[PDB]
């Protein structure tokens, strides 16, 4: 049903993925192209620098898990980064 007269509601299947699309008998070239486009690829997961790991380590050694206290800390967190960013960096480092 169309409670609100919307021309786009039959078209459906505010941020979208930017660097790729999420797309969900025949000639052999077509099948080969699908096969080479569908084959699994590696990701080359970006690691962290030694100094960033040292910074996150020193940050854990004084507060442990209170990410709000680490954000408040001016000495050990000179760039006054938000606790969400530091929590994300800790999760990427595996230091929770």
């Amino acid at each position: 049903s169309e409670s609100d007269a919307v021309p786009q509601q039959q078209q459906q299947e505010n941020h979208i993925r930017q660097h790729d699309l999420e797309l969900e008998s025949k000639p052999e070239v077509l099948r080969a192209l699908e096969r080479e486009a569908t084959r699994p690829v590696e990701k080359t997961v970006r690691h962290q620098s030694e100094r960033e790991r040292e910074w996150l380590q020193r940050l854990v050694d004084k507060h442990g898990d209170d990410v709000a206290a680490m954000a408040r800390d001016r000495k050990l967190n000179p760039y006054q980064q938000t606790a969400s960013d530091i929590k994300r960096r800790l999760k990427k480092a595996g230091l929770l």
Binding site: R51, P78, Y79, Q80
Partner: protein, 49 residues
């Protein structure tokens, strides 16, 4: 009595410099490759020469 700009102040004016951080890391990479000479305090350079 008030500033003309009501724009927010960028966070860069409250945190240490990032350009100098990049320059210092470039210098650290240069010292590690032995391309440039490390720091010696000036009295050492005076007694050496």
């Amino acid at each position: 009595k008030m500033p003309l700009s009501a724009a927010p102040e960028p966070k860069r004016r409250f945190i240490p410099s990032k350009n100098e951080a990049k320059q210092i890391m470039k210098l650290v990479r240069a010292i590690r490759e032995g391309r440039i000479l490390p720091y010696k305090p000036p009295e050492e350079r005076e007694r050496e020469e």
